[PDB]
Design an enzyme around this catalytic site. Structure first.
Site, mmCIF file in Angstrom:
data_model
loop_
_atom_site.group_PDB
_atom_site.id
_atom_site.type_symbol
_atom_site.label_atom_id
_atom_site.label_comp_id
_atom_site.label_asym_id
_atom_site.label_seq_id
_atom_site.Cartn_x
_atom_site.Cartn_y
_atom_site.Cartn_z
ATOM 1 C CG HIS A 88 -4.301 -7.064 4.834
ATOM 2 N ND1 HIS A 88 -3.799 -8.465 4.828
ATOM 3 C CD2 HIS A 88 -3.134 -6.203 4.709
ATOM 4 C CE1 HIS A 88 -2.633 -8.221 4.845
ATOM 5 N NE2 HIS A 88 -2.016 -6.927 4.689
ATOM 6 C CG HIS B 211 5.542 -1.322 6.769
ATOM 7 N ND1 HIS B 211 6.187 -1.915 5.722
ATOM 8 C CD2 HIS B 211 4.287 -1.687 6.863
ATOM 9 C CE1 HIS B 211 5.251 -2.949 5.354
ATOM 10 N NE2 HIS B 211 4.138 -2.728 6.034
#
Ligand code: HEM
Ligand code: HEM
Ligand SMILES: NNC(=O)c1ccncc1
Ligand SMILES: [Cl-]
Ligand SMILES: [Cl-]
Ligand code: NA
Ligand code: NA
EC number: 1.11.1.21
Lengths: 713, 713
Positions: free
Chosen positions: B77, B244
C-alpha cells in the site's frame, strides 16, 4: 479536487504556522527593508504623490478633480481592520492587496486607488513597501488638502501571501446578524476577537445596525467596534468627522449594476473588480457603497464644515439612487458642489452614522466642543490618524525616516532610553551564578521569564519582556502569572539587582527586565546540567524598565493570556478547543510547528505549568531538561482515556496492569494524536535525539526571549 | 471560520508550491538523510525486524503468530498509490503516515502496522526514515517467510507534511462510478491522472467493478489501473499472486461495528483508528476490508499453493460475515488453517480479483505458466516487488546501502557511467563560442535546452536532460519539442560535438547531453549580452548519453508535456484551466512561485514559445534577457479582453486609442490577475529590478538544468 480540509473539516490547521517561508518571498534571503527605506528619497516620493492627487486617469476619473478623499478612505481601510483582541488586521503588512481584504465589499473600488499608485511603486521599487505607501499616500492626501499631520514612520515590510485571520464564520458577504453563524449573541454582544458588525465591513453599517437607520442605535455599534480597534470616544469622533470632511460616497444607480469583486472577476480584469454596467461605470456614475452623500462645501480642502453642517441643519431620512438609507438637510439651499458638473450643486447630506455624532449624548458633547473649537478638532484628528495608522507597528525602535514624531505616546507602551553601559559576558555569568545561589528553582526561573516574554504577539508587535511590565499593574496580578509566586521571585531578583548595581562603578547597571530574562536563562542552563548536560543559553542585554505611569493599564488588558498551552493554562471554558488555541498562541509567538513542539515538551518537564499541575509532566525528573515528554507520550505501553469528571482531562494507564501513570489535557495529547504533530514528537522522542532536543529547545527559548528586541535589528 | 478557499473555491492555489519549507521540517537545514543512512547498521535493523515478526502485541494480535502478511500489505500500500501519469504517490516520501492516506478505507488497520514499528524507528532515529522503514519491513517479512528478495535500496528522505495530490473529486469515500463527480466517463475510461477505481482504494475493488462480482470485468480494471502504475500483465499477475500467497483478509462481522478512521478519531485514540465494537475488536474478530479469505495452506510461508488452489478447484460465489462478495472452493476439504484456533480449518477461498487471474484469457496464460514453472513465478515476483517498491526513487545514483541490486533495469531509465575526463572551464568557453558562431539563435538554443531539461518531475524523479533522450524516440517526435526545429539544432550540435571530440587527446570527450545544456547556457549568455548585461551562466558537466535500447518508449510517453505554460503550450482543450496546469508543472519542477514567475517571464522574451507564438511576448527586443514581460504586463495603459474566436486568448489594446498592442493566453495574464502572482510580477517589473531579474533568471535556469543531477549530490 477533494482535500484533507473537506474530509476532516475540524482537524487542526498547522499551515498557519508555516506562512511567510523564504519559498514564497521574492526578495533575497539577505534583503533588509529598513536598509532600503532608509535610503529612499521620501521627499521625492511625497512630491510625486502630491502631483498624483490632481492627475485624473480616465479609467477612474477623480471626483472634484482630486483623488485625496479616495486615498484617505484607502489608508483608513488599510488600518481599519485592526482588532485589539489579538492584534490581527491593521495596515502594517499591506494585506489590503491580498485576499480576502482586497475583495471585501467595504473595500470596493479601493482596487482603483491601489492601481493609481502602481507608477510610483514601480518608480521607487523595493525602497518603499506597498504597506508604507498606502499610509504615506493618505498622509500626502491630507497634507495636499491643507491638513497638518502629526507625522509618519516607514518600516512596514511587505508580505507576500494572505495572513490566516478569523474574520467570522458567516458564509454570506454582509450577512445581517442572527443567522446560523451570527457573530452576535445576548444583548448585541459581538464575539471576540471580531471588531466589525458584518462580514466584509471595516467597523459598522453606514445605514445603521443591520440596516436600521437609527443614529442612536448606530452609535452603540460605533462605540463598541471602535473600542475593539483601540479608539475611545474622543478619538472616534475625531476620526469620523475628520475623514468625512473630505470627498464623497458613490451610489449613483442600483447596486445590481455592480459585478464581481476582484478575486471573482475574470482574468481580463487584471486584478480589478466591481465593474459597473451603470452608465459610464465610473466618475459621475460611480457606485461603491450605494450611498450618495457629499459632506462639505469644499470636499478637497480641510475645513470645519462637517460640524457646521451637522449642527446647523435638521436632517430628513431619504434614499439614495441605489435605495440605501441616508439623510438630507431640511430646508437647505444647494451649497455642496457636484463632483463633475460645475453648473450643479446639492443640498447637504449625512449618513446615519454621521448623525450618531450629534444624537448620542456622549458623542454630542465632544462634537460640540470640536465644532466650537476646530483647533481642538484638528489636533485630535491628527493624533488619532497617527495612532490609527501606526497602531500595529510595534516598538518606536521600528519607526523609520525623517517624519517620526518625537512625542512619546502612552499607547506605544514606551520603553525608556538606556543611558549607561551594559553588562558584559562576565557580568552575565556572575549574575546567573548569583541567581542560582539565591535558592530560586528551575521552575521559578523558567516560569517567570516565560511569563514576562510570552506576552509578545507578532500580529501588532506588542508585548514581550522589554519594559519589565510583569512587575507592574496589570501583569503582576494576572492569574496565569501566579501573582503570589511571581511577587516572591521578583523580590529576590530585585535584591540581586540592587546588590549588583550598588557594587558597580562607571555607571554600569542591569535593568530588571534584563535580569528577569537572564535569570530564566540560568534556569534553563541549570535544567540542562540537572540532565547531565553543560550548555550556555544565549543572552542579549539592553532591555529597559518602564514605569507604571508609562503603562496604560486598560490597553494592557488585551495581552492577558486567557489560554496558554505552553503553561497548560485555560482561564475558563471556551467553544474553541484548547489545541486550536495552542496553535493560535504559537502563531502569535511566530513559532513554527517544530518550534512549538520542542518548546512545549521542554516547558512541561521544567515545571512551567500554572499551579504546578501535573498534566503533561511526563517525567520522573522534573526540572531536568530532557526529552522525557516525547518518549513517554509516544509509549504504546500506555493507554489513554478521558476522565468521568472532565472529558478534557485524560488518564494514562499501563495497558497491561491498569496502573495510573500520568494525566494530561488536550494540549498535551494532541502531540500524540495529530498526524503531523506526532511526526514531530517522534523526532524528539527518538533514542538519538537528546542533543538535538536540548539544542533546539535553547534556540526557541532564546527566540522567545528576543521577540520584542527591535533595538537589536 | 470562513477561508479564501470558501469564498473563491476556483481561484488558483499557490500554497502547493511552498509546501515543504524549512519552517515545517524539524531537521536542521543542513541535515542530509543520505549521510545518516549510510552510517546505519542495516543488518542490526533487519535483525530487529525479524524479531518483531513474531512478537505479538495484545492490542493487535498477530494472525498465525506472524505479522508478515500485515507488513507485506503495508509496504504494498505504501508503494501502491503511485501513478505514472504524474509520478505522484508511491512509497518514496512515506506519505502513508499523513492525511489523507493514513485514513483511506483501503489502509484500514495499517495504522496498527505502523505503530508496531515505532520501537524500531525510535531506536534508530534519523538514520532510517519512515519511508525506507515501511519498505524494508515488507522485505524482511518476505525474507522471514522464506522468499528471497531481489534487493533493497535506502534513501527515501522523510517528509513532514501532506503532499498536495489530486486523488479525485468525489465527496464520498469509496463512491461507486457515475456520480456527480465520477472519475469514469465513456466506456469505463478512468480520468487522468487517477490510477484507482474508487476514492480511497489503492487500485481496484476486491468484490469486482463497482461491487459487481464478475472476475472477467474485474480483470479489465486490474489491467488498466496496474498499467497506470507502470506494471504490465506479467508483473501484475506476479504481484497479485505473490502477495496473496501470504496472510489473510479480515471480515469477521458487520462493517457497521468499525468506528472512525484515524483523522476522525478522538484524541485519546492517539493516532489510531477503525476501533471495532465487534467482539474483541481485533485478532480473530478483526474487520478490515469486510472480506474473509485465506488463500493458502501455509499463510506464513512462501509456497506454490496460490496457483494450486486457483486452478485446482471450481469456485462458488458466497458472502463473508460482513456481507461482501467472495468465492469458496466447491467440494473442498477444510485444509486452510485458522489464524487463532488450532482446532479449526477452512475451505480455500478467493477474491473476485484473484479469480481474474484465471478467467481473463491473457492472465490465464501467465498464471498457467507460473503454476507449471514456479521458479519463473518466484523470479517475476521478486523483480516486480523491487520495481513496485523502488519505482519512484529516480536515478540509481540515489540508491543507498549494501543491498542495492547490481543489475540495471530498463524501467530505471538508466544512464551509462562516465568513463573519461570531463570538459573543463576552458573547454566550456570554447564550446560555447563554437555554438554561438554556428548561427544557432538564442531562441533555438534556449528552446532546445528547456525541452531537454524540463521533462524532470520531482514526484518520481524521472526525466531531465541527463541521457540526451531528447534525441531519441519518443521525445524527438513530441509536438511540444518542435520536431523539425529540434532536428536542425541537434544536427548542428552533433557536428560541433564530433569536431570537438575528434580533436581531443586522451580520453576527453563531451556528451551530447552536456552540450545541449551548455548550448542553452550560451543562449542565455548571448541574450543577456543582447540586453547590455555581462552574465556568466553556471554549467556542470558530467551528463552521459543513453541509447535507444536504454529508453523504454512506452514508459517515456507519460513524460510528454501536453501542457507546458513555460512554452505557452497546450496540446488540446482540457477541463482543468491552463493556469492550474502551469502551477502543477511548476510543482513537478520543484519551483516556488517566485521561481515560476521569473522563469516564465524570461522564457517569453527569449523566444521559448512553441511555434514562435507571439502570445505573452511582451517586448520589442525578443532574444534579449530583460524584464519587459513584467513591465508591459503591468502597464495600466493597456486594456485586456477575450477574443470572439477564442475565450482563452486575450487582446491587449491601448486604452486611449483601441490599437492592438499584444495578445496573451490565460497563462500569460494570470500573472496580472491573481493577487499573489501579480505581487511577484510587480517586484520584477519595478524600475530597480533589471539586474535582480537577470540574476534570478540565471539562478532558476541553472536549477532546472541540474534537476536530475543526483550524480553531483
Ligand atoms: C462609523 C465609521 C465610518 C463609516 C460607517 C464610514 C462610512 C463610509 C462610507 C459608506 C463611505 C462611502 C464609500 C463610497 O461609496 O465611496 C465613506 C467614505 C469615506 N470615508 Fe468613511 N466611514 C467611517 C469612518 C471613516 C474614518 C474613520 C475615516 C478617516 C479618518 C473615513 C474617511 C472617509 C473618506 C475620506 C471617504 C470618502 C471617499 C471618497 O472621496 O472616495 N471614514 N465612509
Ligand atoms: C488487484 C489487486 C489487489 C486487490 C484487490 C487486493 C485486495 C486485498 C484485500 C481486500 C485484502 C484484505 C485486507 C484485509 O481485510 O485485511 C488484501 C490483503 C493482502 N494483500 Fe492484496 N490485493 C491486491 C494486490 C496485492 C498485491 C500486489 C500485494 C503484494 C504484493 C498484496 C498483498 C496482500 C497481503 C500480503 C495481504 C494480507 C494482509 C494480512 O495478512 O493482514 N495484495 N488484499
Ligand atoms: N505531489 N508531489 C509532487 O508533485 C512532487 C514531490 C517532490 N518534488 C516535486 C514534485
Ligand atoms: Cl493580519
Ligand atoms: Cl505524492
Ligand atoms: Na496586525
Ligand atoms: Na511520487
Amino acid at each position: 479536487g477533494t482535500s484533507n480540509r473537506d474530509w476532516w473539516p475540524n482537524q487542526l490547521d498547522l499551515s498557519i504556522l508555516h506562512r511567510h517561508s523564504s519559498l514564497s518571498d521574492p526578495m533575497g534571503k539577505d534583503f533588509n527593508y529598513a536598509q532600503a527605506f532608509e535610503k529612499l528619497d521620501l521627499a521625492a516620493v511625497k512630491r510625486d504623490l502630491h502631483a498624483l492627487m490632481t492627475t485624473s486617469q480616465d479609467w477612474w476619473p477623480a471626483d472634484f478633480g482630486h483623488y485625496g478623499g479616495l486615498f484617505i478612505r484607502m489608508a483608513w481601510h488599510s488600518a481599519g481592520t485592526y482588532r485589539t483582541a489579538d492584534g490581527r488586521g491593521g495596515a502594517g503588512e499591506g494585506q489590503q492587496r491580498f485576499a480576502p481584504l482586497n475583495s471585501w465589499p467595504n473595500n470596493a473600488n479601493l482596487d482603483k486607488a491601489r492601481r493609481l499608485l502602481w507608477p510610483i511603486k514601480q518608480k521607487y521599487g523595493r525602497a518603499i513597501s506597498w504597506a508604507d505607501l498606502l499610509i504615506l499616500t493618505g498622509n500626502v492626501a491630507l497634507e495636499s488638502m491643507g491638513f497638518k499631520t502629526f507625522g509618519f514612520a516607514g518600516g512596514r515590510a511587505d508580505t507576500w501571501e494572505p495572513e490566516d485571520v478569523y474574520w467570522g464564520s458567516e458564509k454570506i458577504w454582509l450577512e445581517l446578524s442572527g443567522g446560523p453563524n451570527s457573530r452576535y449573541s445576548g444583548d448585541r454582544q459581538l464575539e471576540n476577537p471580531l471588531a466589525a458588525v458584518q462580514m466584509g465591513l471595516i467597523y459598522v453599517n453606514p445605514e445603521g445596525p443591520d440596516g436600521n437607520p437609527d443614529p442612536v442605535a448606530a452609535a452603540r455599534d460605533i462605540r463598541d467596534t471602535f473600542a475593539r480597534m483601540a479608539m475611545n470616544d474622543e478619538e472616534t469622533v475625531a476620526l469620523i468627522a475628520g475623514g468625512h470632511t473630505f470627498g464623497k460616497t458613490h451610489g449613483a444607480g442600483p447596486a445590481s449594476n455592480v459585478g464581481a469583486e476582484p478575486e471573482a472577476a475574470g482574468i481580463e480584469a487584471q486584478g480589478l473588480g466591481w465593474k459597473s454596467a451603470y452608465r459610464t461605470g465610473k466618475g459621475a456614475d460611480a457606485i461603491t457603497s450605494g450611498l450618495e452623500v457629499t459632506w462639505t462645501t469644499t470636499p478637497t480642502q480641510w475645513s470645519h464644515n462637517f460640524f457646521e453642517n451637522l449642527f446647523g441643519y435638521e436632517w430628513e431620512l431619504t434614499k439614495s439612487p441605489a435605495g440605501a438609507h441616508q439623510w438630507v438637510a431640511k430646508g437647505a439651499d444647494a451649497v455642496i458642489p457636484d463632483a463633475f458638473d460645475p453648473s450643479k450643486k446639492h443640498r447637504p447630506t449625512m449618513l446615519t452614522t454621521d448623525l450618531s455624532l450629534r444624537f448620542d449624548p456622549a458623542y454630542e458633547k465632544i462634537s460640540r466642543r470640536f465644532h466650537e473649537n476646530p483647533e481642538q478638532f484638528a489636533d485630535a484628528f491628527a493624533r488619532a490618524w497617527f495612532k490609527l495608522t501606526h497602531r500595529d507597528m510595534g516598538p518606536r525602535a521600528r519607526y523609520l525616516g525623517p517624519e517620526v514624531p518625537a512625542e512619546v505616546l502612552l499607547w506605544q507602551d514606551p520603553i525608556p532610553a538606556v543611558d549607561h553601559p551594559l553588562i558584559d559576558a562576565a557580568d552575565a555569568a556572575e549574575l546567573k551564578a548569583k541567581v542560582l545561589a539565591s535558592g530560586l528553582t528551575v521552575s521559578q526561573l523558567v516560569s517567570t521569564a516565560w511569563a514576562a516574554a510570552s506576552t509578545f504577539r507578532g500580529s501588532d508587535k506588542r508585548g514581550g519582556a522589554n519594559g519589565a511590565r510583569i512587575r507592574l499593574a496589570p501583569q503582576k496580578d494576572w492569574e496565569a502569572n501566579q501573582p503570589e509566586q511571581l511577587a516572591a521571585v521578583l523580590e529576590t531578583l530585585e535584591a540581586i539587582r540592587t546588590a549588583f548595581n550598588g557594587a558597580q562603578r562607571g555607571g554600569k547597571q542591569v535593568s530588571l527586565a534584563d535580569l528577569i530574562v537572564l535569570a530564566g536563562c540560568a534556569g534553563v542552563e541549570q535544567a540542562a546540567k540537572n540532565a547531565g548536560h553543560a550548555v550556555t543559553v544565549p543572552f542579549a542585554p539592553g532591555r529597559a524598565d518602564a514605569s507604571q505611569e508609562q503603562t496604560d493599564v486598560e490597553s494592557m488588558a488585551v495581552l492577558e493570556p486567557v489560554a496558554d498551552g505552553f503553561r497548560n493554562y485555560l482561564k475558563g471554558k471556551y467553544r474553541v478547543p484548547a489545541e486550536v488555541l495552542l496553535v493560535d498562541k504559537a502563531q502569535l509567538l511566530t513559532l513554527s510547528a517544530p518550534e512549538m513542539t520542542v518548546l512545549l515538551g521542554g516547558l512541561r518537564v521544567l515545571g512551567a505549568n500554572v499551579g504546578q499541575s501535573r498534566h503533561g509532566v511526563f517525567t520522573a525528573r522534573e526540572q531536568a531538561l530532557t526529552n522525557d515528554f516525547f518518549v513517554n507520550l509516544l509509549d504504546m505501553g500506555t493507554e489513554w482515556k478521558p476522565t468521568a469528571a472532565d472529558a478534557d482531562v485524560f488518564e494514562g494507564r499501563d495497558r497491561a496492569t491498569g496502573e495510573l501513570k500520568w494525566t494530561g489535557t488536550r494540549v498535551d495529547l494532541v502531540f500524540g494524536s495529530h498526524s503531523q504533530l506526532r511526526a514531530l514528537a517522534e523526532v524528539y522522542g527518538s533514542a538519538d535525539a537528546q542533543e538535538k532536543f536540548v539544542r533546539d529547545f535553547v534556540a526557541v527559548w532564546n527566540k522567545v526571549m528576543n521577540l520584542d528586541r527591535f533595538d537589536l535589528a
